[PDB]
Scaffold this active site. Structure first.
Site, PDB file in Angstrom:
ATOM      1  N   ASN A 148     -79.525 -46.550  12.879  1.00  0.00           N
ATOM      2  CA  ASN A 148     -78.637 -45.393  12.850  1.00  0.00           C
ATOM      3  C   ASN A 148     -77.631 -45.328  11.703  1.00  0.00           C
ATOM      4  O   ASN A 148     -76.690 -44.532  11.747  1.00  0.00           O
ATOM      5  CB  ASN A 148     -77.972 -45.210  14.204  1.00  0.00           C
ATOM      6  CG  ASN A 148     -78.979 -45.240  15.327  1.00  0.00           C
ATOM      7  OD1 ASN A 148     -78.977 -46.159  16.155  1.00  0.00           O
ATOM      8  ND2 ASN A 148     -79.885 -44.259  15.337  1.00  0.00           N
ATOM      9  N   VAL A 195     -72.798 -43.215   9.321  1.00  0.00           N
ATOM     10  CA  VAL A 195     -73.318 -43.381  10.669  1.00  0.00           C
ATOM     11  C   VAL A 195     -73.854 -42.054  11.174  1.00  0.00           C
ATOM     12  O   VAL A 195     -73.197 -41.020  11.047  1.00  0.00           O
ATOM     13  CB  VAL A 195     -72.247 -43.911  11.632  1.00  0.00           C
ATOM     14  CG1 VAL A 195     -72.854 -44.209  12.987  1.00  0.00           C
ATOM     15  CG2 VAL A 195     -71.631 -45.165  11.065  1.00  0.00           C
ATOM     16  N   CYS A 196     -75.061 -42.083  11.725  1.00  0.00           N
ATOM     17  CA  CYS A 196     -75.587 -40.906  12.385  1.00  0.00           C
ATOM     18  C   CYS A 196     -75.383 -41.117  13.880  1.00  0.00           C
ATOM     19  O   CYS A 196     -75.985 -41.987  14.513  1.00  0.00           O
ATOM     20  CB  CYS A 196     -77.053 -40.638  12.008  1.00  0.00           C
ATOM     21  SG  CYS A 196     -78.354 -41.395  13.033  1.00  0.00           S
ATOM     22  N   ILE A 197     -74.452 -40.361  14.426  1.00  0.00           N
ATOM     23  CA  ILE A 197     -74.149 -40.473  15.832  1.00  0.00           C
ATOM     24  C   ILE A 197     -73.837 -39.086  16.370  1.00  0.00           C
ATOM     25  O   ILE A 197     -72.971 -38.382  15.841  1.00  0.00           O
ATOM     26  CB  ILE A 197     -73.002 -41.459  16.051  1.00  0.00           C
ATOM     27  CG1 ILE A 197     -72.446 -41.334  17.464  1.00  0.00           C
ATOM     28  CG2 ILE A 197     -71.916 -41.246  15.006  1.00  0.00           C
ATOM     29  CD1 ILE A 197     -71.971 -42.651  18.009  1.00  0.00           C
ATOM     30  N   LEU A 207     -73.490 -48.004  20.035  1.00  0.00           N
ATOM     31  CA  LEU A 207     -74.600 -47.791  19.123  1.00  0.00           C
ATOM     32  C   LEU A 207     -74.963 -49.083  18.373  1.00  0.00           C
ATOM     33  O   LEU A 207     -76.131 -49.326  18.059  1.00  0.00           O
ATOM     34  CB  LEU A 207     -74.283 -46.652  18.155  1.00  0.00           C
ATOM     35  CG  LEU A 207     -75.502 -45.840  17.735  1.00  0.00           C
ATOM     36  CD1 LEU A 207     -76.070 -45.099  18.930  1.00  0.00           C
ATOM     37  CD2 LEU A 207     -75.142 -44.863  16.625  1.00  0.00           C
TER      38      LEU A 207
END
Ligand SMILES: COCC(=O)N[C@@H](Cc1ccc(-c2cc(Cl)cc(Cl)c2)cc1)[C@H](O)[C@@H](O)C(=O)O
Lengths: 76, 168
Positions: B79, B86-88, B114
């Protein structure tokens, strides 16, 4: 034995729980569903940077009396 | 503006009550829209003893629009992008998507989650995703994912010494 632990929601709510050291994480989420109706499969409990696994116990993490867990949710 | 009051408040509340293994500071005092995040890997994990650095950038309309979270430290993770972004889900337009109720404490807790349990359904790095899934499915028999993690961690000791921080 006798012991309480605290669980903090993302909203700031503190949920108080009655537990034993032999209780698993799987059945503490059971404890949580009973009060908040959140299905145990989407529950995630964090302590000291760790997400606790179902099937381990409070004793294996040496979670002692009155430690505060932090709740986070996950669908997938 | 409401932004500047909102940010100043979450700061004092985060410093009065830290999220465990995260330390919050301003890059420059007297700018509240950019923060420094110091992050310490927990004992009995492969991130053990490690020291990590990230930055947060807040938009003019916070908390109506979500901030950006980027690692300065180089991180291998399904992620996390090449850039350190950060891809969240909660940082994009349920409590996993962005709305004015959300805050920094929540973002942090979500990132810890995550770090613990990557999103392998919609990953930003699928090489790391494949490697993680392989590590998992093999019950620890494969060490390729973990060896990389150990090394980066070991590298961070140079960052700590360079910043004068003592790693608990
Ligand atoms: C591929 O596995 C990488 C790893 O170390 N995962 C751990 C969870 C984990 C726990 C905490 C974090 C963590 C938490 C914080 Cl607060 C900061 C950082 Cl840098 C990492 C990361 C992963 C696992 O328990 C792993 O030890 C294991 O024993 O399988």
């Amino acid at each position: 034995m006798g012991m309480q632990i605290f669980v903090k929601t993302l909203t700031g709510k503190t949920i108080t729980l009655e537990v034993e050291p032999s209780d698993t994480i799987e059945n503490v989420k059971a404890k949580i569903q009973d009060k908040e109706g959140i299905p145990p499969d989407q529950q995630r409990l964090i302590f000291a940077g760790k997400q606790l696994e179902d099937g381990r116990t409070l004793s294996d993490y040496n979670i002692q009396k009155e430690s505060t867990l932090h709740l986070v949710l996950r669908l997938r | 503006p409401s932004s500047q009051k909102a940010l100043l408040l979450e700061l004092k509340g985060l410093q009065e009550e830290p999220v465990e293994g995260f330390r919050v500071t301003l890059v420059d005092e007297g700018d509240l829209y950019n923060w420094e995040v110091a992050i310490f890997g927990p004992p009995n994990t492969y991130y053990e003893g490690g020291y990590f650095k990230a930055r947060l950038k807040f938009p003019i309309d916070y908390p109506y629009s979500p901030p950006a979270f980027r690692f300065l430290t180089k991180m291998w993770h399904p992620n996390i992008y090449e850039t350190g972004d950060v891809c969240i889900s909660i940082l994009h337009p349920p409590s996993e998507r962005w709305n004015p109720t959300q805050n920094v404490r929540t973002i942090l807790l979500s990132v810890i989650s995550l770090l613990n349990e990557p999103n392998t359904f919609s990953p930003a790095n699928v090489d790391a995703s494949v490697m993680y899934r392989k590590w998992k499915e093999s019950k620890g028999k494969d060490r390729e994912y973990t060896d990389i993690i150990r090394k980066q961690v070991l590298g961070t000791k140079v960052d700590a010494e360079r910043d004068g921080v003592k790693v608990p």
